Amino acid sequence: IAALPRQKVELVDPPFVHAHSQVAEGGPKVVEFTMVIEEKKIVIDDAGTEVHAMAFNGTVPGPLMVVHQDDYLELTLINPETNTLMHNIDFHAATGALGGGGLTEINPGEKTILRFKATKPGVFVYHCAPPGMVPWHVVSGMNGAIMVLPREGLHDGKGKALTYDKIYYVGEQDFYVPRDENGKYKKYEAPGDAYEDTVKVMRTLTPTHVVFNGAVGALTGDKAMTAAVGEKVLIVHSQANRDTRPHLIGGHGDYVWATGKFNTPPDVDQETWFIPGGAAGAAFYTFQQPGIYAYVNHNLIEAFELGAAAHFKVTGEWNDDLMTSVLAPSG
Amino acid sequence: IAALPRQKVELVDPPFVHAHSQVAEGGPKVVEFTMVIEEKKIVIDDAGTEVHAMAFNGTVPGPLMVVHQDDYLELTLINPETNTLMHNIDFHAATGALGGGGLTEINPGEKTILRFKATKPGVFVYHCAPPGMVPWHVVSGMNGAIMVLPREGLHDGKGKALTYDKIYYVGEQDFYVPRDENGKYKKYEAPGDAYEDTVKVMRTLTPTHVVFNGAVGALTGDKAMTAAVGEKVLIVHSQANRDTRPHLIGGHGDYVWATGKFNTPPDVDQETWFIPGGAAGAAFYTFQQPGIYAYVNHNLIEAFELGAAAHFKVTGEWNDDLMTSVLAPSG
Amino acid sequence: IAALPRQKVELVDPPFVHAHSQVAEGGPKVVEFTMVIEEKKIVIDDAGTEVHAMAFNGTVPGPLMVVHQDDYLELTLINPETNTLMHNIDFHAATGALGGGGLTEINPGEKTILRFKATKPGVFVYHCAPPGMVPWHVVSGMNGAIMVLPREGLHDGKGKALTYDKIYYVGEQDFYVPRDENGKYKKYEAPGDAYEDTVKVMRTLTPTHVVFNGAVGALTGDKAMTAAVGEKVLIVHSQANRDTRPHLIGGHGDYVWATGKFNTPPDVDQETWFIPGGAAGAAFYTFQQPGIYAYVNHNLIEAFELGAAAHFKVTGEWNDDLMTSVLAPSG
Ligand SMILES: [Cu+2]
Ligand SMILES: [Cu+2]
Ligand SMILES: [Cu+2]
Ligand SMILES: [Cu+2]
Ligand SMILES: [Cu+2]
Ligand SMILES: [Cu+2]
User: Fold this and answer.
1) Which residues are CB-neighbours of A48 under 8 A, at least 6 positions away?
2) B128 Cβ partners below 8 Å, 6+ apart?
3) DSSP letter assigned to residue C137
4) Which end of chain A has the lower number of beta carbons within 10 A, N or C?
5) In what helix (H) or strand (E) does residue A277 lie, and over which residues does it extend?
6) Contact, A212 vs A171, CB < 8 A?
7) What domains can you pick out in chain C, each with its CATH number?
8) Which chains touch A (3 or more CB pairs under 8 A)?
9) Which residues pair with B244 in a beta bridge?
10) Distance in Å, alpha carbon of A46 to nearest chain B alpha carbon
11) Which residues bind Cu cation 2 (chains A, B, C)?
């Protein structure tokens, strides 16, 4: 492995993904990533509701990491001195020691380096899982995903290559914010102060917010993801704790690896797919019509009342053969 | 498209389906449908619980429309002056303008005509989706399904054609009825009056009723579906807002397009299948034994406490080889 | 049929499975099983919470029965005079009379014998279903699963035989235990006394406990399942009433018949699979690394707060190629 070429990769904040090649450029290499854990307060809605996030690289969700099958992913995880809690990381893509969790427990002021072989292709969830406080770290936003591309890039069930023009990473988070006796969300001066209260809400299994990329409207308006008619887009989606049912309003999932494993053939022409909590999935789509599209968790209450809605702004020419207003709304 | 043949279809109330041919007769055509939206109070159980439904063509679910791949569906949607709300329609089978929702917003007293090419084969959900009040209209019964059949009819995963003798459309609905101080269901003069309270229930993500065809027991008793031993039946099921897990008690789902897409090979020998909220699915089965069968959502609490149960009354001869009581209940 | 060989099989309590051959050793035979129903009080957590269980063979879940496709399963069901309720059994594997539910309704002091032909291969759920009290009996622990193996044993997508060295049956149960005004779980003298209170909790659709093998921690520590590096393990998992998303922390599901049906090709390299309420599924995995593994329901709140977590204790040598701590947690 010492003789294997190494390469440092720079991570970019979601929904964007760091530079990479779909088809493996050469042979197996050791790909290096460094992430710093940041315990920070984040405002998740327009009412000012705060959540003491625990974030990888400072964002919720943590960045998407990309390697190819059989490469080695080497991660330098750092838990700064300014943090108050112990943290670790669990890659569902790895094999052994609880996905690496048993080998990466670092307290504030510590760091560690873990190397694992990306033996299985597909998109996988990764997240913090500290013994005794596993769900809390996860629902505080401490999770992300990694994509392990096949050496020869993406393909459909029947062997045809699927090359994408754009890739977006949508991380869905369920938050459980405690309320005081008047229905007002509470605020705390430190992460640990919220624990006891958060656990009570978690047990009801009913989130107060379900958001994409850390906040209500995070990916809407001018933060909308963009594409153009004719462009091929791969949308990676993950949920480390609760189920979701993604749906592109106005579009479809031409090829969907709902389970997120590339060795399992993709479902085609999907209207709404399902991604169970603890997994990541991927949908490939070629836009045919311009305009705005809403990407949502299709439990519409979760999408429109809880916050799970994002936008796609597509430029191009309308196709009247596909759809047309024969008679505009008139009396 | 004007040179294409056109055909008007008269819709039938669920669980029945309007006459259609499985194999597309000739070439593409423009299939025309007309639906009138009706805001009406419906009683959903024996206790007299009422809901202010928003019903396509007056029923919950709305009727099933059947077209073939590459046909054009031309829908004339009418929102009567007697209605108090604006409505529209989003077809999951359509490409562009939020499934047609952006092009069909009509106020009471208005009408519009939309046309789209049915490009992908499968069963799809259609529902109302007015900006700012999407979940409210959907959970008020404003949803249904469309079936876009392959021009050569259905086929199993490996070519064998699958021809059904009967087709039933079971639309499943999650309702959120507000309760008063005594735990009794509230009643309002108009739909608008129910909004705030309904919204509070919706946010708990817990429905008060989960019904088939608009009411608890709507498809039991003499309204039970019928078949005969040897009959091939296709059961289309849809849930526009939340997940469901259909199961035929005493039977199986021989071929199940759980995602509802015909270009995706069906699963076979299914005991219980899953349909994510915002999608429709289809299960094909050939009856082997006579008697009553219960068709339910297999979270038995939703099925027997909340209302998600229907019956099948099948005639024919008992097959002792398949099953027999060796010793009837005795001392 | 009458000339068919008969065979009495002695059942063992889960997670263990009675003796069987993966490849059918002869032609069809009538496999005979006997189960006694026991209504008993069980403690489901470390806080002494009691539940009046209704258990097939005295366990929660009921034992796993293994037969081969086209064999006949003849079950003798006994409901002792000491019991207080009528019970029956519904096999999702059977065809007719509600899975046998309509032919096996026995009052305390009665027995019955049912025979059915196991026509479809896969793992299926079986549960009690007394008309008008279906959910209550099922959520009181009265369910299990049966495995109908293909005559030629298990196979992957392209006819490659998959032979397991070990098999474990994890039965997951959702309990709904009432609480008094003080938030303390309630205890009852007889099962029937708990009915009214239990049903009001069931309607919230939120379980108080979600356990594996009848109790929190039932398969952890000294009761952890065992395997070694190199062994191929088949894990059968069932949930008769509610969805679950199994995940082996530190491992994967190399082959997963998520739907539990062997005629439906398995998904591969799964990180987390989904089993809808009312079905059984099976995952095949070959251990590569030693140590402890946690097998959980991946909604981590249900796993670590509600009780749905088990362990695997694996012996063998560590593979540093797959994973290695490059720099142990340091300053
Ligand atoms: Cu952490
Ligand atoms: Cu995990
Ligand atoms: Cu509407
Ligand atoms: Cu929709
Ligand atoms: Cu029972
Ligand atoms: Cu059942």
Assistant:
1) none
2) B37, B54, B56, B87, B88, B89, B90, B137, B138, B142, B143
3) H
4) C
5) none
6) yes
7) 1-150 (2.60.40.420), 151-317 (2.60.40.420)
8) B, C
9) B275
10) 16
11) 92, 127, 298
- Asked if C147 and C65 count as a contact pair (C-beta separation under 8 A), the reply is yes
Distance CA B198, CA B194 (A): 6
Residues near C255 by Cβ (< 8 Å), separated by ≥ 6?
C156, C162, C266, C267, C268, C283, C284
CA distance A124 to A145: 5
> What's the reported resolution, in angstroms, to a tenth?
2.0
Q: Is A247 one of the catalytic residues?
A: yes
Categorise residue A179: left if φ over 0, alpha if ψ from -120 to 50, beta otherwise: beta
Residue C75 CA to residue B15 CA, distance in Å, equals 37
C7 touches chain B (CB under 8 A): no
Three-state secondary structure call for residue C275: strand
Residue written as tokens 């395997």?
A: C227
In contact, A114 and C325? CB cutoff 8 Å: yes
Q: What does the alpha-carbon distance between residue A308 and residue A252 come to, in Å, rounded to a whole number?
A: 18
The SS3 call for residue C151 is: coil
Element housing A304 (H / E): helix A300-304
Q: Between vectors from CA C146 to CA A243 and to CA C105, what angle results, nearest 5°?
A: 105
C 162-221 near B (Cβ less than 8 A): 199, 202-206
Tokens representing residue A242 in the block: 């609760």
Q: Are the CB atoms for A134 and C300 separated by under 8 Å?
A: yes
Sheet of A225-228: strand order equals A225-228, A309-315, A291-297, A246-249
Which residue has 């080695």 as its token pair?
A: A72
CA–CA gap between residue A115 and residue A30 (Å, rounded): 8
The sheet carrying B225-228 orders its strands as: B225-228, B309-315, B291-297, B246-249
